[PDB]
């Protein structure tokens, strides 16, 4: 399955414990989050908002980087990773008009995104969802999903601080940081 839909509302297995608009306009506060797989999923009862994205092919990663990620990255769904974060991100529109080399330079050569992220594995599990090429309008360009143990929360926060200080983050115009704890 490539398509995932994140429903914020009154029902779901993830309890929302924090929501902050890091950049741009806030999203409505909600108590629970549900994640559904596939292209024809139902809207859960009591849904306030729905965000959809699709996993996709690599846009920047080179083979040598891929091999490092494969060696180090954890799986989604670990028993002990009871904390999660959903971080919807929208880029500045100018980003999308840049050429491929220009974006790769900002992303990795300047911002060191992968290099930094690698330093937080195996603590942090991740999944990247793309929104901008779906058939239907989405308010964000990416839905980023993370999972980690409670004891790794401060490491996750440090990762975010490092990325938010990067050149790449100058191009982030909306970013919502939603923190979750899995239901018992």
């Amino acid at each position: 399955t490539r398509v995932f839909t994140f429903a914020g509302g009154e029902t779901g297995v993830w309890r929302v414990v924090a929501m902050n608009a890091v950049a741009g306009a806030p999203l409505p506060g909600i108590p629970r989050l549900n994640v559904a797989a596939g292209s024809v999923s139902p809207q859960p009862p009591g849904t306030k908002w729905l965000l959809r994205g699709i996993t996709s092919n690599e846009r920047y990663v080179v083979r040598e980087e891929k091999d490092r990620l494969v060696a180090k990255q954890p799986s989604l769904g670990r028993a002990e990773a009871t904390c999660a974060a959903l971080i919807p991100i929208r880029k500045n529109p100018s980003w999308w008009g840049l050429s491929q080399d220009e974006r790769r330079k900002i992303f990795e050569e300047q911002s060191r995104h992968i290099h930094i992220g690698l330093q937080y594995l195996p603590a942090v599990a991740r999944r990247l969802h793309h929104c901008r090429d779906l058939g239907e309008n989405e308010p964000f360009d990416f839905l980023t999903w993370f999972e980690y143990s409670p004891s790794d929360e401060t490491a996750f926060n440090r990762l975010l601080a490092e990325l938010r200080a990067s050149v790449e983050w100058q191009y982030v115009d909306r970013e919502i940081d939603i923190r979750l704890v899995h239901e018992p």
Copy 2:
């Protein structure tokens, strides 16, 4: 509406008359007499439609600044009055392609296949638009909808371009290709 999404509606309606449907690789689409290029998503299917193909224009995945600047200078506008021929060429690439890393695909696409280098040789004759399908969902029949416009005097040239690209390393990964030729109504 989003200015990036288009639906190609094969059927009994539209400004484009279908003159040929070439089954280049893999199974063809049902024969159609006309083509409509609609903004956005189409539902329900208009009377007379046999099929709908949707795609979205998107950001560059491979081109570098030096290439882009060449393209911007040389490429013609879409919608030129004299460019009464068009081609709609749906393309699918195989699963192996999509699992390759970015450097591997860029190497195939340009360093080996010379896609852009070749295509530049056919500007300003040929106007083009690339539409992406694979991030609409897992169940689109093609990965790309490619659209071209040219004058009838440039049709032989366009055919030469196609033969060059179809001989390239990149095309080793193409597992479906249909080539539909159109002429604009008067």
